[PDB]
Amino acid sequence: STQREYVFIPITNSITIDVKITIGGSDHITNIDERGIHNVLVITGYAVDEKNGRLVPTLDPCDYVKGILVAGTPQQAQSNDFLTLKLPANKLYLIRKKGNISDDLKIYIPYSSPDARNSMKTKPVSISDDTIVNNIIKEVFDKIYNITQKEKVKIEKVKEDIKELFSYYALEQ
Amino acid sequence: STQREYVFIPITNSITIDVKITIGGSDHITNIDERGIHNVLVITGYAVDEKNGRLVPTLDPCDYVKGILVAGTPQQAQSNDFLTLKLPANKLYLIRKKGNISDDLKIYIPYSSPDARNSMKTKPVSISDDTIVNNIIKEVFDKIYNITQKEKVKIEKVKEDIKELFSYYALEQ
Amino acid sequence: STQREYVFIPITNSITIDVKITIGGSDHITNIDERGIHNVLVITGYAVDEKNGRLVPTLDPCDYVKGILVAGTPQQAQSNDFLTLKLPANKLYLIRKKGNISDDLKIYIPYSSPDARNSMKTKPVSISDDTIVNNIIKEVFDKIYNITQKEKVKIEKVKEDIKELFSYYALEQ
Amino acid sequence: LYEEDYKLALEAFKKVFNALTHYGAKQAFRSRARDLVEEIYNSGFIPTFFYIISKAELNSDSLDSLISLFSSDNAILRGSDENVSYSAYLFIILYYLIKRGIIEQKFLIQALRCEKTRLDLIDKLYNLAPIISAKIRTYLLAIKRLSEALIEAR
Amino acid sequence: LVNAGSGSIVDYVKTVLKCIRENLNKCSCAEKIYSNEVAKVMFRVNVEKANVEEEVKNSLEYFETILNEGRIIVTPAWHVSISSALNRGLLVELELVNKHKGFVIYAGGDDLLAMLPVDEVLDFIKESRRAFAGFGTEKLGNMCLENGFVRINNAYYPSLPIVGRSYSVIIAHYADPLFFVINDSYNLLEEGKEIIRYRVMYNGEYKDAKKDVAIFRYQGLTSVIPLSLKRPIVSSVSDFNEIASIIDVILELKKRIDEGRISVSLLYDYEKYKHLIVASDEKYLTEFLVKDWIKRNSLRKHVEFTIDEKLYGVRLTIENYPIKIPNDLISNIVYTLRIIYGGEK
Ligand SMILES: [Mn+2]
């Protein structure tokens, strides 16, 4: 088994360094082989959280929130707010597959309070404002994925698939 | 309006104590008017259990559990491990819809420990082996719902609307 | 060579003891491995002989007999009328073919005569009357096929295809 | 038109069928169904009714059986298969008369309950014998055929 | 539709279908379960993009415009397949007709016209109906009429069992003007198809169908035999003997009337049992009434030919028309034989 925690992609900055080591498990799956993002596990059922950037649960399956499959150890401020599940790996939610996996995984899940005293709604927004299509990448992809800055300098192909792929509904709360 | 709490129907009596007030406010979202249960509710991503019959959290793309809405509170002593949410009533998932909306409800849901220690194995479950199915009609829609079975003697109709509506998943261990 | 037994499959209640090599060797052609009946032989220009069932030698091209093929020898009181032919395990028109054979087969086939003293017109009939298929799956299946009833709790997946794949041309004479 | 009389015949026959419990009672009633309509239309309704009642032995037990049978469908007629068959036929006639509005169920059920009133019931029948004979023929023939078909020859 | 698939694509649909009212009504029900498509990609990968937010949306819009409005989508393939299947039927009933001493006047895709001797009518229909659905007790010319298909000796070709087919049979004197016989056959089945309802078995319960009848007429003696008593006609692979079973009944009856097993009065005494039978609804009382009517005019005492129970409660709901039709099946079984044994005077 290997640990695989999930992280979002917001226009704000909520993941700069939240894991000790950038490798974690002994083998990765989500990589870059010159054809956009690959083997991305995605979370359906939960929602993206902008203010106090977290993972918050709602009750509308229309919400699709694309992210990234990072791995490692949860910084030792979690597991009493986090909740983790361990599944037979045919229970993942992956899009843009590049080959299968047969390995039980320990999928760390963030958690936010559902804010049970308020009306919470979402809006369809894709990442825009190109002053923001170049600022999440310099936070996460450079550190975790060693394959970048060591196998490809053509980052223009990933400068495009942030305004179309990682689409998360806005909150406005 | 009310602080709604949820009741799904496993193949057993695994949800009977989480219905305390049984009346709470006045009206409901679920409809049962002479032709089975209309406006039935459902959560996606969870699965019932046998021992500790609460809804396990999963990122399984197939999990879903369906059930009825009943008024009250589970105990007003839990929610250290119970998930509660308020939403303005436009994030609903009424299966077999017939009616209108119920004014910005809060919702309670049964919840279990994701418990990354055992291989989860959930199968699609339906309703069978009627012996357990009667007593809950005398425990979910008789001592609780006072307009159903006080208006329509046709038990053979609704029992078909029941046997083919609550489609849920479960670990079976 | 590897001696074989071609079980003819009508609805007759007279297939009791005609395969005498129950296990005997190492591989029986007609195989049931978690996916139903495969390695199915169908020999054309023939039909059943319900009165002491056999494969009646006819000339019609639309006539045939849909029998199974295992390794056996009938009752050691024959080699008088049965069909004792060897072909190099290649010309076998096999349906649902998953693997090949030992490139040579000696098969003992129930083989009657025209016994022509009356008219003989072809009659196409099927297997029906689910007690019929249920009388043979205890008459022959448990005897030859041990892998049923213990490895497949999908008992119907093997009972289904018989009612849509196991035809036979009769005589009704 | 008298098409209703086949529904009537069927339900009355179901009654007097599942009432007579022993099979000898059934075969006796079969013989009654056959011969008594012949007698009704050869001799008259009143003579044949007198003949029937005389062989039915209307005691208190038999008559409560008949009344409960009008109502229940769980009653059971006992008591000397010849008599029980003649009483089954008496019930067939009275059941027609009731279910078709010739005798009033209240007057009749009263009359089977008391003895001053059996005579007045018989008198009331006599006063309507033409109407009863005219209207009951199809019903009785249906009952006769039903007995021939459903009860085994003896 | 959900079953028209196979293997794994079937599941691809076997989930995606109901997720409209069963689900969030839009293109996010399948996105969860879409992945079992992408669970086979990399062995000889050819595809350009795996971002399917369209082929889940499009395979939802497809079924939405066709279940929101519960029709089918028609294709050139649909039409050409059906027309071809009509041509195979053309061949096979062309062989059927002249199998008996028939004489085609017009064998059409879905229609027919012929003249037969009054001895070969029922047995003809009984097969021609079955043969139309695709079912053979026989090889016809050289076509194998299997269950559901018409296999040309290796070519399994689909027949049309789901398509109904009505029949209209006139027993005409040779010295009758053809003008009238043709008019009153065409209009007979013309309004007979559009007027007569019968008690049928839909979803297990009881419904009233309106077509797949087999009308007769001698000269004022009309009779109607239904042909399916099920809706759809053959919903199972072995329902192929529900079809035209009634004419099997009439054959087993007519075959024994003349062999001296059953008197001639079998068809003159039903006018004494008909009322009880149609006034009954307890099918064992009716079974015994029929058994008694069969037995009381038996030449021996030892023939035991019984009618199936399911042919007891069906009722021929014809309405508001000056034509005379008995409102219960067995009376029509009787009148059909009345016609046919009358077509020999
Ligand atoms: Mn027309």
mmCIF file of N, CA and C in Angstrom, chain B residues 45 76 80 112 120:
data_model
loop_
_atom_site.group_PDB
_atom_site.id
_atom_site.type_symbol
_atom_site.label_atom_id
_atom_site.label_comp_id
_atom_site.label_asym_id
_atom_site.label_seq_id
_atom_site.Cartn_x
_atom_site.Cartn_y
_atom_site.Cartn_z
ATOM 1 N N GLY B 45 -22.013 8.221 -2.829
ATOM 2 C CA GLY B 45 -20.674 8.087 -2.293
ATOM 3 C C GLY B 45 -20.588 7.296 -1.010
ATOM 4 N N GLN B 76 -29.080 14.521 19.386
ATOM 5 C CA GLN B 76 -28.566 15.782 19.936
ATOM 6 C C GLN B 76 -27.432 15.547 20.934
ATOM 7 N N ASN B 80 -19.943 14.338 16.825
ATOM 8 C CA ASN B 80 -18.498 14.178 16.815
ATOM 9 C C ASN B 80 -18.064 13.317 15.636
ATOM 10 N N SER B 112 -20.086 6.837 9.037
ATOM 11 C CA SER B 112 -19.216 5.832 9.626
ATOM 12 C C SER B 112 -17.758 6.228 9.426
ATOM 13 N N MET B 120 -12.398 -2.409 1.483
ATOM 14 C CA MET B 120 -13.816 -2.182 1.247
ATOM 15 C C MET B 120 -14.263 -2.932 0.001
#
